[PDB]
Amino acid sequence: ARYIGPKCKLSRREGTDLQLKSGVKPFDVKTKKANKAPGQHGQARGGKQSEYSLQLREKQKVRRIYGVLERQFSNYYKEAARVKGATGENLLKLLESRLDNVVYRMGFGSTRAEARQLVSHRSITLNGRRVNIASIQVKAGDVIAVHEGAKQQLRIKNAIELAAQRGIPAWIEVDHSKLEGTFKAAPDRSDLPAEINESLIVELYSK
Amino acid sequence: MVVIRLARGGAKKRPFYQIVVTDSRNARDGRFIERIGFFNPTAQGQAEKLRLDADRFAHWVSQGAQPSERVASLAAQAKKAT
Amino acid sequence: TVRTLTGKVVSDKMDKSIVVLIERRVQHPLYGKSIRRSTKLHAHDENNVAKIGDVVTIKESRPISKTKAWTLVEVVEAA
Amino acid sequence: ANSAQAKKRARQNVKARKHNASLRSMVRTYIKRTLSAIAGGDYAVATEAYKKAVPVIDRMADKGIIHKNKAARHKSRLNAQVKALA
RNA sequence: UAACUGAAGAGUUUGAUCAUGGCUCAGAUUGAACGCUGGCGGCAGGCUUAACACAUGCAAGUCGAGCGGGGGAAGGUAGCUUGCUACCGGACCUAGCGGCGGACGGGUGAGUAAUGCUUAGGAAUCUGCCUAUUAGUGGGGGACAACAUCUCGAAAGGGAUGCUAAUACCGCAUACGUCCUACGGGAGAAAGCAGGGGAUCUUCGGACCUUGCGCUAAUAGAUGAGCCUAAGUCGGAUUAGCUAGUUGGUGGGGUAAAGGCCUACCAAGGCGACGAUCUGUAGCGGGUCUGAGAGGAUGAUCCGCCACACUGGGACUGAGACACGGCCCAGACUCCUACGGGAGGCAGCAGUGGGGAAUAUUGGACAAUGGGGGGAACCCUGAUCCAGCCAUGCCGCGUGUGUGAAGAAGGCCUUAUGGUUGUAAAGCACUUUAAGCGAGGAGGAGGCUACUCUAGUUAAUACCUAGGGAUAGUGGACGUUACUCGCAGAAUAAGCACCGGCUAACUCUGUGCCAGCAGCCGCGGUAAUACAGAGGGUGCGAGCGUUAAUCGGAUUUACUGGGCGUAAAGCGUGCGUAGGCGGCUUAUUAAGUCGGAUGUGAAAUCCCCGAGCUUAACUUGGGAAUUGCAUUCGAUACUGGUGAGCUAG
């Protein structure tokens, strides 16, 4: 199962832009109701929260951008705790290693939902083979190319020109002419945005 | 008597055999005397297809153990390969 | 190459048979204190040399009677 | 019995039981005769009884009616008891 | 490279407070059940209760190359109403005798507190088929099934007379090994069948030669089983004495084998507070769940051992049984009957009735791995491999994507016009995973037959055995396989719990200690954020909740790790038995204690590094671990033993 429904109330509850829309218009012009919770009893951002509320609200925000549900997220945490290293760093590496996210960051999809649809509809090839699972883990030195029938899609060309506005990350090199790209290694924490706090998730799941 | 034969394991539609020396009256996947290799009829990629311990095989044959048809064919093929 | 036990004789009434008491010291599995345990073993003594109070050695052998499976080897100390 | 082979096995069983019982009674009788001669106590008579008894015991031991260990034990013990008569 | 890294609290006694102490909650887990809801795939699991009773079908056969009969097909030859007859050699089949198998594989946990199981050892045993080696396979005889006659019974099946073959049975002869022995000696076996053939003979149809499969005697190996020892293995003293074959010995019997295993005498021993006897409960282990660990609970699915087969008692055959689908006897129950006489045991697979909260099809194939028979061809196999049913569990996927606001309509609240539903919707532009339709299409099959060649055995090129080569055939239940490629169009696809605190998420209507809610504390007696509906929201998601059960939190049986003046808890006070503990110095011992080495600690399971499944579950290679046990070699500080000495007790 994948979440379907309204994305702007989703972002409004967390109070921050979750990048769930293409971005042709800024978030503030898009919703006009930011810093207001979706409910009628919705209030400003300054509402006091308990620690349990803060940890939960952070984990939900982390889940909502990547579109992962609770079972898979708990499995991700349990694997990251087993793997040696920083638990939050490992969890971020696992979340950023999914095939759909790599397709999105390579610029073949306007949004992560578009990337998921493209991957699921067998429009992507991994190392020369057409796959259809969004949660396939991408390893170092991989090659992701757009399938031949998938090429010449107006949505894909719009996605690549939109991605041109943002910056192509370091670990991904893309030939946009050939619709091809190469994942090299998992981003370190510095590459990812620093507003995300992972410690809250850590004690929330280690309670 | 004492035989050398295949015991089945693995998953449905993907058999994986251990090569065992055992009394013939025992159940196929039960009690055995000694395991001396394995056979994987559907190996792919880097997976090995047949490991057989030739010295143990010869030692047990010298004591009157009777290989099955499949195990004898596999032993001949392994000797041919190596 | 044969299992031997050393003990003290507690009975000699039976003909060609003696009863020797073996003692061992072990640790209690849970509380850790050292405990002493005792076992009474019937042995075969053909010539009735042993008597009550001597220290004897016995060795394991094939059954001789219903309750005897050990045989006397030597008398270490006399009473 | 439910099967034809089971019925045939039962038939062969009763036949073999009769045959083996007769052959075993023969050995018992000969050993009894030797024991009776021993009780009589004449050395020559006991020797004759033992010499007559031994071949029957060996013949029925070779057929599997009795075990060869049992036959050897019988022969040894009877020979000792005969020798005791001097 | 690695094989581990691990421990949270809260509510409730009182007008406050601190302590003590119970009760309750937050976690993990399940062979689960129930309520609402429900798209797909992969891999697993599926009578825990009545070891209750069972309709029906299947679950153990095979060998004519051991043997005599007996059948029904064709062919050939003869004749003649002429395509029909009668004769003759080969090809097939099998009721009976006989061999092997039926003691395996499959099911269940009733019984069993030790004849069982686990760990480590031992000596006095047997062992079909398999491997190695040695010596043989000579010559006779009497029977009995089938068959024929008679007879009983509707039958089912019984009974009585007369024949007959054999690798069926029994003498005689011979004996490298073998058994007994008084060391002189004595005793004991067997069976033939098949393929091919040069020469020779053939009393006329074989001898003979050779090669296989067989059979007899014996020694080793391997495998399997029997027997013995030590240490461990749940409660009860509101169970304290138990035992006369009982404990030991001698003569004899008995077993494959030690042994009161049995028997006749002789003696009075044997077990017990370190728990005998009696009594309740219970299959045991590898393991599984939980826990920081120590521990606690548990013994479905997988593997090893044990026990049982309607209830009890026996033995036969056999290498092996005291034998699930064998025999005899007793008992209960059920069935057929012409009343003469008979029959049966699903705790095998499927299935029925019943019980229960609750657990599935009266399916396919021997293609694969095994098992039985056979020289082979091949036959059997409810083991097994597959398929069907069930959200029971785990893992994965989908139910669409972007855009779209002077914020449409409608709903809910209100300080009555705003807020919210909400980019949500409509509208615009796109995509086709999975399901549906069409086409193609691996792997699970190694092999076997045909041809040819080489090497062995032989007198032989023949036969047989072991190998090589290319080609051609033949071999898949799953199966409309996995997988790949085309067509259609958003078209086929979201619910459940909750919003006073513990605990993330609030308002309005309806009712007024009523109806009702409730895990604990507690809500409702006209403004209910706690009852019912609605709007909104929160948490999960093909699932969501409730009930039941185990461990945890519980330091709430405290070994790790608690207490006893007043909270529960020092016997009314002494003496004393078993037991526990015990002053200083010295010599010795090596039991406790410590160290090394060797053997063992099954596999699977847990953990680590990899490999194959589009990923994951799952499968799998190698390690690490299995904290234990036994033997043996060392150390002597402390504890114990022994000898000597001392005076502070």
Side-chain angles (χ1 to χ4, degrees), chain A residues 2 7 12 30 36 82 114 121:
Chain A
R2 182 191 70 261
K7 297 98 170 36
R12 282 167 46 192
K30 188 63 174 165
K36 288 196 62 175
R82 203 195 55 89
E114 195 81 315
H121 282 185

PDB file of all heavy atoms in Angstrom, chain A residues 2 7 12 30 36 82 114 121, chain E residues 399 401 404 420 422 424 431 608:
ATOM      1  N   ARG A   2       0.441   2.258  -0.764  1.00  0.00           N
ATOM      2  CA  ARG A   2       1.112   3.549  -0.807  1.00  0.00           C
ATOM      3  C   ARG A   2       0.094   4.625  -0.452  1.00  0.00           C
ATOM      4  O   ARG A   2      -1.084   4.503  -0.799  1.00  0.00           O
ATOM      5  CB  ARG A   2       1.723   3.811  -2.184  1.00  0.00           C
ATOM      6  CG  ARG A   2       2.478   5.131  -2.276  1.00  0.00           C
ATOM      7  CD  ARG A   2       2.857   5.509  -3.702  1.00  0.00           C
ATOM      8  NE  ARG A   2       1.711   5.884  -4.521  1.00  0.00           N
ATOM      9  CZ  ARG A   2       1.103   5.073  -5.374  1.00  0.00           C
ATOM     10  NH1 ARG A   2       1.498   3.822  -5.539  1.00  0.00           N
ATOM     11  NH2 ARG A   2       0.074   5.530  -6.081  1.00  0.00           N
ATOM     12  N   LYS A   7      -1.396  16.439  -0.380  1.00  0.00           N
ATOM     13  CA  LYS A   7      -0.013  16.578   0.065  1.00  0.00           C
ATOM     14  C   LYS A   7       0.226  17.885   0.814  1.00  0.00           C
ATOM     15  O   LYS A   7       1.110  17.956   1.679  1.00  0.00           O
ATOM     16  CB  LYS A   7       0.931  16.475  -1.132  1.00  0.00           C
ATOM     17  CG  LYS A   7       0.897  15.133  -1.844  1.00  0.00           C
ATOM     18  CD  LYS A   7       0.014  15.175  -3.077  1.00  0.00           C
ATOM     19  CE  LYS A   7       0.176  13.913  -3.905  1.00  0.00           C
ATOM     20  NZ  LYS A   7       0.381  12.718  -3.044  1.00  0.00           N
ATOM     21  N   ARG A  12       1.661  20.935   5.687  1.00  0.00           N
ATOM     22  CA  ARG A  12       1.246  21.971   6.628  1.00  0.00           C
ATOM     23  C   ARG A  12       1.298  21.470   8.063  1.00  0.00           C
ATOM     24  O   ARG A  12       1.633  22.229   8.979  1.00  0.00           O
ATOM     25  CB  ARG A  12      -0.165  22.454   6.285  1.00  0.00           C
ATOM     26  CG  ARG A  12      -0.237  23.411   5.107  1.00  0.00           C
ATOM     27  CD  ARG A  12      -1.672  23.602   4.636  1.00  0.00           C
ATOM     28  NE  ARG A  12      -2.586  23.835   5.747  1.00  0.00           N
ATOM     29  CZ  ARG A  12      -3.907  23.809   5.646  1.00  0.00           C
ATOM     30  NH1 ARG A  12      -4.508  23.575   4.491  1.00  0.00           N
ATOM     31  NH2 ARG A  12      -4.645  24.023   6.731  1.00  0.00           N
ATOM     32  N   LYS A  30       1.674  28.231  -3.314  1.00  0.00           N
ATOM     33  CA  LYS A  30       0.911  27.024  -3.610  1.00  0.00           C
ATOM     34  C   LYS A  30      -0.235  26.821  -2.625  1.00  0.00           C
ATOM     35  O   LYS A  30      -1.368  26.548  -3.037  1.00  0.00           O
ATOM     36  CB  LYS A  30       1.837  25.807  -3.613  1.00  0.00           C
ATOM     37  CG  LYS A  30       1.175  24.533  -4.109  1.00  0.00           C
ATOM     38  CD  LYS A  30       0.734  24.673  -5.556  1.00  0.00           C
ATOM     39  CE  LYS A  30       0.214  23.355  -6.104  1.00  0.00           C
ATOM     40  NZ  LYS A  30      -0.540  23.540  -7.375  1.00  0.00           N
ATOM     41  N   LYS A  36      -0.461  26.855   9.531  1.00  0.00           N
ATOM     42  CA  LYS A  36      -1.779  26.507  10.046  1.00  0.00           C
ATOM     43  C   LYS A  36      -1.978  25.009   9.877  1.00  0.00           C
ATOM     44  O   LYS A  36      -1.837  24.483   8.767  1.00  0.00           O
ATOM     45  CB  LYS A  36      -2.880  27.274   9.311  1.00  0.00           C
ATOM     46  CG  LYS A  36      -2.959  28.750   9.635  1.00  0.00           C
ATOM     47  CD  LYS A  36      -4.294  29.320   9.185  1.00  0.00           C
ATOM     48  CE  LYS A  36      -5.454  28.659   9.911  1.00  0.00           C
ATOM     49  NZ  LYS A  36      -6.760  29.288   9.562  1.00  0.00           N
ATOM     50  N   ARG A  82      21.801  -2.902  13.647  1.00  0.00           N
ATOM     51  CA  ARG A  82      22.718  -4.034  13.551  1.00  0.00           C
ATOM     52  C   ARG A  82      24.013  -3.638  12.856  1.00  0.00           C
ATOM     53  O   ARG A  82      25.103  -4.007  13.307  1.00  0.00           O
ATOM     54  CB  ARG A  82      22.051  -5.190  12.810  1.00  0.00           C
ATOM     55  CG  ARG A  82      22.654  -6.545  13.120  1.00  0.00           C
ATOM     56  CD  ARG A  82      22.216  -7.585  12.108  1.00  0.00           C
ATOM     57  NE  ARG A  82      22.520  -7.173  10.742  1.00  0.00           N
ATOM     58  CZ  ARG A  82      23.662  -7.428  10.119  1.00  0.00           C
ATOM     59  NH1 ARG A  82      24.643  -8.083  10.717  1.00  0.00           N
ATOM     60  NH2 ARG A  82      23.824  -7.013   8.867  1.00  0.00           N
ATOM     61  N   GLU A 114       6.316  10.548  -9.009  1.00  0.00           N
ATOM     62  CA  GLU A 114       6.590  10.303 -10.421  1.00  0.00           C
ATOM     63  C   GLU A 114       7.687   9.263 -10.597  1.00  0.00           C
ATOM     64  O   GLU A 114       7.587   8.386 -11.462  1.00  0.00           O
ATOM     65  CB  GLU A 114       6.977  11.610 -11.112  1.00  0.00           C
ATOM     66  CG  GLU A 114       6.936  11.567 -12.633  1.00  0.00           C
ATOM     67  CD  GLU A 114       5.545  11.753 -13.203  1.00  0.00           C
ATOM     68  OE1 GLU A 114       4.592  11.129 -12.691  1.00  0.00           O
ATOM     69  OE2 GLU A 114       5.400  12.533 -14.168  1.00  0.00           O
ATOM     70  N   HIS A 121       6.245   1.029 -13.408  1.00  0.00           N
ATOM     71  CA  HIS A 121       5.750   0.726 -14.744  1.00  0.00           C
ATOM     72  C   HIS A 121       6.828   0.167 -15.661  1.00  0.00           C
ATOM     73  O   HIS A 121       6.653   0.183 -16.884  1.00  0.00           O
ATOM     74  CB  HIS A 121       5.126   1.972 -15.374  1.00  0.00           C
ATOM     75  CG  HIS A 121       3.755   2.284 -14.864  1.00  0.00           C
ATOM     76  ND1 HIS A 121       2.986   3.306 -15.374  1.00  0.00           N
ATOM     77  CD2 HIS A 121       3.012   1.704 -13.893  1.00  0.00           C
ATOM     78  CE1 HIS A 121       1.829   3.344 -14.738  1.00  0.00           C
ATOM     79  NE2 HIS A 121       1.820   2.382 -13.833  1.00  0.00           N
TER      80      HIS A 121
ATOM     81  P     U E 399      -0.841   2.330  -8.105  1.00  0.00           P
ATOM     82  OP1   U E 399      -0.827   3.087  -9.379  1.00  0.00           O
ATOM     83  OP2   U E 399      -0.053   2.810  -6.947  1.00  0.00           O
ATOM     84  O5'   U E 399      -2.356   2.189  -7.639  1.00  0.00           O
ATOM     85  C5'   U E 399      -3.362   1.799  -8.560  1.00  0.00           C
ATOM     86  C4'   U E 399      -4.657   1.470  -7.862  1.00  0.00           C
ATOM     87  O4'   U E 399      -4.423   0.480  -6.829  1.00  0.00           O
ATOM     88  C3'   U E 399      -5.338   2.610  -7.125  1.00  0.00           C
ATOM     89  O3'   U E 399      -6.064   3.472  -7.986  1.00  0.00           O
ATOM     90  C2'   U E 399      -6.212   1.872  -6.120  1.00  0.00           C
ATOM     91  O2'   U E 399      -7.382   1.370  -6.747  1.00  0.00           O
ATOM     92  C1'   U E 399      -5.316   0.687  -5.756  1.00  0.00           C
ATOM     93  N1    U E 399      -4.538   0.943  -4.524  1.00  0.00           N
ATOM     94  C2    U E 399      -5.186   0.748  -3.323  1.00  0.00           C
ATOM     95  O2    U E 399      -6.341   0.375  -3.248  1.00  0.00           O
ATOM     96  N3    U E 399      -4.431   1.000  -2.211  1.00  0.00           N
ATOM     97  C4    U E 399      -3.123   1.422  -2.177  1.00  0.00           C
ATOM     98  O4    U E 399      -2.583   1.607  -1.089  1.00  0.00           O
ATOM     99  C5    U E 399      -2.520   1.602  -3.459  1.00  0.00           C
ATOM    100  C6    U E 399      -3.233   1.364  -4.562  1.00  0.00           C
ATOM    101  P     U E 401      -1.061   9.324  -7.335  1.00  0.00           P
ATOM    102  OP1   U E 401      -0.194   9.497  -6.144  1.00  0.00           O
ATOM    103  OP2   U E 401      -2.362  10.031  -7.412  1.00  0.00           O
ATOM    104  O5'   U E 401      -0.205   9.729  -8.614  1.00  0.00           O
ATOM    105  C5'   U E 401       1.191   9.479  -8.675  1.00  0.00           C
ATOM    106  C4'   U E 401       1.830  10.256  -9.797  1.00  0.00           C
ATOM    107  O4'   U E 401       1.259   9.835 -11.061  1.00  0.00           O
ATOM    108  C3'   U E 401       1.604  11.759  -9.765  1.00  0.00           C
ATOM    109  O3'   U E 401       2.529  12.428  -8.925  1.00  0.00           O
ATOM    110  C2'   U E 401       1.728  12.158 -11.228  1.00  0.00           C
ATOM    111  O2'   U E 401       3.092  12.285 -11.595  1.00  0.00           O
ATOM    112  C1'   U E 401       1.150  10.934 -11.936  1.00  0.00           C
ATOM    113  N1    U E 401      -0.274  11.101 -12.307  1.00  0.00           N
ATOM    114  C2    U E 401      -0.575  11.891 -13.396  1.00  0.00           C
ATOM    115  O2    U E 401       0.274  12.472 -14.047  1.00  0.00           O
ATOM    116  N3    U E 401      -1.912  11.990 -13.694  1.00  0.00           N
ATOM    117  C4    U E 401      -2.953  11.380 -13.028  1.00  0.00           C
ATOM    118  O4    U E 401      -4.112  11.555 -13.407  1.00  0.00           O
ATOM    119  C5    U E 401      -2.557  10.573 -11.916  1.00  0.00           C
ATOM    120  C6    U E 401      -1.263  10.459 -11.607  1.00  0.00           C
ATOM    121  P     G E 404      -0.380  24.833 -11.023  1.00  0.00           P
ATOM    122  OP1   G E 404       0.002  26.211 -11.415  1.00  0.00           O
ATOM    123  OP2   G E 404      -0.004  24.316  -9.683  1.00  0.00           O
ATOM    124  O5'   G E 404      -1.960  24.710 -11.183  1.00  0.00           O
ATOM    125  C5'   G E 404      -2.639  25.297 -12.285  1.00  0.00           C
ATOM    126  C4'   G E 404      -4.083  24.865 -12.320  1.00  0.00           C
ATOM    127  O4'   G E 404      -4.144  23.419 -12.427  1.00  0.00           O
ATOM    128  C3'   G E 404      -4.888  25.188 -11.070  1.00  0.00           C
ATOM    129  O3'   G E 404      -5.414  26.503 -11.085  1.00  0.00           O
ATOM    130  C2'   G E 404      -5.957  24.106 -11.063  1.00  0.00           C
ATOM    131  O2'   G E 404      -7.000  24.424 -11.972  1.00  0.00           O
ATOM    132  C1'   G E 404      -5.182  22.914 -11.618  1.00  0.00           C
ATOM    133  N9    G E 404      -4.569  22.100 -10.551  1.00  0.00           N
ATOM    134  C8    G E 404      -3.257  22.135 -10.148  1.00  0.00           C
ATOM    135  N7    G E 404      -2.989  21.301  -9.184  1.00  0.00           N
ATOM    136  C5    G E 404      -4.199  20.673  -8.937  1.00  0.00           C
ATOM    137  C6    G E 404      -4.532  19.667  -7.999  1.00  0.00           C
ATOM    138  O6    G E 404      -3.796  19.116  -7.175  1.00  0.00           O
ATOM    139  N1    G E 404      -5.872  19.312  -8.080  1.00  0.00           N
ATOM    140  C2    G E 404      -6.778  19.855  -8.954  1.00  0.00           C
ATOM    141  N2    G E 404      -8.030  19.383  -8.884  1.00  0.00           N
ATOM    142  N3    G E 404      -6.480  20.794  -9.833  1.00  0.00           N
ATOM    143  C4    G E 404      -5.183  21.152  -9.771  1.00  0.00           C
ATOM    144  P     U E 420      -8.964  28.653   6.932  1.00  0.00           P
ATOM    145  OP1   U E 420      -7.515  28.530   7.228  1.00  0.00           O
ATOM    146  OP2   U E 420      -9.405  29.159   5.608  1.00  0.00           O
ATOM    147  O5'   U E 420      -9.644  27.231   7.168  1.00  0.00           O
ATOM    148  C5'   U E 420      -9.343  26.447   8.315  1.00  0.00           C
ATOM    149  C4'   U E 420     -10.228  25.227   8.386  1.00  0.00           C
ATOM    150  O4'   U E 420     -11.612  25.640   8.495  1.00  0.00           O
ATOM    151  C3'   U E 420     -10.202  24.326   7.162  1.00  0.00           C
ATOM    152  O3'   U E 420      -9.117  23.416   7.185  1.00  0.00           O
ATOM    153  C2'   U E 420     -11.562  23.643   7.203  1.00  0.00           C
ATOM    154  O2'   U E 420     -11.544  22.552   8.112  1.00  0.00           O
ATOM    155  C1'   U E 420     -12.444  24.741   7.794  1.00  0.00           C
ATOM    156  N1    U E 420     -13.209  25.504   6.780  1.00  0.00           N
ATOM    157  C2    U E 420     -14.485  25.070   6.485  1.00  0.00           C
ATOM    158  O2    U E 420     -14.981  24.081   6.997  1.00  0.00           O
ATOM    159  N3    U E 420     -15.162  25.826   5.561  1.00  0.00           N
ATOM    160  C4    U E 420     -14.701  26.958   4.924  1.00  0.00           C
ATOM    161  O4    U E 420     -15.428  27.534   4.115  1.00  0.00           O
ATOM    162  C5    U E 420     -13.375  27.351   5.290  1.00  0.00           C
ATOM    163  C6    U E 420     -12.694  26.632   6.186  1.00  0.00           C
ATOM    164  P     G E 422      -9.372  17.980   2.619  1.00  0.00           P
ATOM    165  OP1   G E 422     -10.230  18.096   1.414  1.00  0.00           O
ATOM    166  OP2   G E 422      -8.611  16.731   2.866  1.00  0.00           O
ATOM    167  O5'   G E 422      -8.333  19.186   2.609  1.00  0.00           O
ATOM    168  C5'   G E 422      -7.272  19.232   1.659  1.00  0.00           C
ATOM    169  C4'   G E 422      -6.912  20.651   1.295  1.00  0.00           C
ATOM    170  O4'   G E 422      -7.885  21.135   0.333  1.00  0.00           O
ATOM    171  C3'   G E 422      -6.923  21.631   2.466  1.00  0.00           C
ATOM    172  O3'   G E 422      -5.782  22.516   2.488  1.00  0.00           O
ATOM    173  C2'   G E 422      -8.256  22.367   2.319  1.00  0.00           C
ATOM    174  O2'   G E 422      -8.241  23.703   2.777  1.00  0.00           O
ATOM    175  C1'   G E 422      -8.535  22.293   0.817  1.00  0.00           C
ATOM    176  N9    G E 422      -9.961  22.161   0.506  1.00  0.00           N
ATOM    177  C8    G E 422     -10.771  21.113   0.870  1.00  0.00           C
ATOM    178  N7    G E 422     -12.003  21.243   0.465  1.00  0.00           N
ATOM    179  C5    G E 422     -12.010  22.453  -0.211  1.00  0.00           C
ATOM    180  C6    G E 422     -13.072  23.124  -0.866  1.00  0.00           C
ATOM    181  O6    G E 422     -14.251  22.771  -0.989  1.00  0.00           O
ATOM    182  N1    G E 422     -12.649  24.325  -1.420  1.00  0.00           N
ATOM    183  C2    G E 422     -11.371  24.817  -1.348  1.00  0.00           C
ATOM    184  N2    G E 422     -11.165  25.996  -1.947  1.00  0.00           N
ATOM    185  N3    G E 422     -10.371  24.204  -0.739  1.00  0.00           N
ATOM    186  C4    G E 422     -10.758  23.032  -0.196  1.00  0.00           C
ATOM    187  P     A E 424      -3.318  18.837  -3.020  1.00  0.00           P
ATOM    188  OP1   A E 424      -2.473  17.824  -2.345  1.00  0.00           O
ATOM    189  OP2   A E 424      -3.345  18.841  -4.499  1.00  0.00           O
ATOM    190  O5'   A E 424      -4.787  18.622  -2.447  1.00  0.00           O
ATOM    191  C5'   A E 424      -5.827  18.176  -3.301  1.00  0.00           C
ATOM    192  C4'   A E 424      -7.020  17.675  -2.531  1.00  0.00           C
ATOM    193  O4'   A E 424      -7.507  18.701  -1.621  1.00  0.00           O
ATOM    194  C3'   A E 424      -8.233  17.343  -3.379  1.00  0.00           C
ATOM    195  O3'   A E 424      -8.132  16.098  -4.045  1.00  0.00           O
ATOM    196  C2'   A E 424      -9.361  17.436  -2.368  1.00  0.00           C
ATOM    197  O2'   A E 424      -9.351  16.314  -1.499  1.00  0.00           O
ATOM    198  C1'   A E 424      -8.922  18.666  -1.574  1.00  0.00           C
ATOM    199  N9    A E 424      -9.423  19.899  -2.212  1.00  0.00           N
ATOM    200  C8    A E 424      -8.689  20.991  -2.597  1.00  0.00           C
ATOM    201  N7    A E 424      -9.395  21.934  -3.167  1.00  0.00           N
ATOM    202  C5    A E 424     -10.685  21.429  -3.164  1.00  0.00           C
ATOM    203  C6    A E 424     -11.903  21.948  -3.631  1.00  0.00           C
ATOM    204  N6    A E 424     -12.027  23.142  -4.210  1.00  0.00           N
ATOM    205  N1    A E 424     -13.010  21.195  -3.480  1.00  0.00           N
ATOM    206  C2    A E 424     -12.893  20.001  -2.893  1.00  0.00           C
ATOM    207  N3    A E 424     -11.806  19.402  -2.421  1.00  0.00           N
ATOM    208  C4    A E 424     -10.719  20.175  -2.584  1.00  0.00           C
ATOM    209  P     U E 431       1.400   8.792 -22.470  1.00  0.00           P
ATOM    210  OP1   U E 431       2.436   8.667 -23.527  1.00  0.00           O
ATOM    211  OP2   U E 431      -0.032   8.630 -22.820  1.00  0.00           O
ATOM    212  O5'   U E 431       1.758   7.748 -21.327  1.00  0.00           O
ATOM    213  C5'   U E 431       2.984   7.842 -20.619  1.00  0.00           C
ATOM    214  C4'   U E 431       2.919   7.085 -19.321  1.00  0.00           C
ATOM    215  O4'   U E 431       1.982   7.733 -18.422  1.00  0.00           O
ATOM    216  C3'   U E 431       2.409   5.658 -19.418  1.00  0.00           C
ATOM    217  O3'   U E 431       3.408   4.745 -19.834  1.00  0.00           O
ATOM    218  C2'   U E 431       1.882   5.398 -18.013  1.00  0.00           C
ATOM    219  O2'   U E 431       2.951   5.115 -17.124  1.00  0.00           O
ATOM    220  C1'   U E 431       1.305   6.764 -17.650  1.00  0.00           C
ATOM    221  N1    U E 431      -0.142   6.859 -17.943  1.00  0.00           N
ATOM    222  C2    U E 431      -1.034   6.357 -17.016  1.00  0.00           C
ATOM    223  O2    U E 431      -0.698   5.834 -15.967  1.00  0.00           O
ATOM    224  N3    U E 431      -2.352   6.490 -17.364  1.00  0.00           N
ATOM    225  C4    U E 431      -2.866   7.056 -18.509  1.00  0.00           C
ATOM    226  O4    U E 431      -4.086   7.095 -18.669  1.00  0.00           O
ATOM    227  C5    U E 431      -1.882   7.553 -19.416  1.00  0.00           C
ATOM    228  C6    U E 431      -0.589   7.440 -19.106  1.00  0.00           C
ATOM    229  P     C E 608      25.002 -11.067  12.685  1.00  0.00           P
ATOM    230  OP1   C E 608      24.986  -9.591  12.813  1.00  0.00           O
ATOM    231  OP2   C E 608      24.047 -11.730  11.766  1.00  0.00           O
ATOM    232  O5'   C E 608      26.474 -11.505  12.262  1.00  0.00           O
ATOM    233  C5'   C E 608      27.619 -10.908  12.854  1.00  0.00           C
ATOM    234  C4'   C E 608      28.888 -11.358  12.172  1.00  0.00           C
ATOM    235  O4'   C E 608      29.074 -12.781  12.369  1.00  0.00           O
ATOM    236  C3'   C E 608      28.928 -11.181  10.663  1.00  0.00           C
ATOM    237  O3'   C E 608      29.285  -9.863  10.283  1.00  0.00           O
ATOM    238  C2'   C E 608      29.939 -12.231  10.223  1.00  0.00           C
ATOM    239  O2'   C E 608      31.262 -11.757  10.407  1.00  0.00           O
ATOM    240  C1'   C E 608      29.688 -13.350  11.233  1.00  0.00           C
ATOM    241  N1    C E 608      28.821 -14.435  10.713  1.00  0.00           N
ATOM    242  C2    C E 608      29.350 -15.408   9.857  1.00  0.00           C
ATOM    243  O2    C E 608      30.538 -15.330   9.524  1.00  0.00           O
ATOM    244  N3    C E 608      28.547 -16.403   9.409  1.00  0.00           N
ATOM    245  C4    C E 608      27.273 -16.454   9.791  1.00  0.00           C
ATOM    246  N4    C E 608      26.511 -17.447   9.331  1.00  0.00           N
ATOM    247  C5    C E 608      26.714 -15.482  10.664  1.00  0.00           C
ATOM    248  C6    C E 608      27.516 -14.507  11.101  1.00  0.00           C
TER     249        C E 608
END
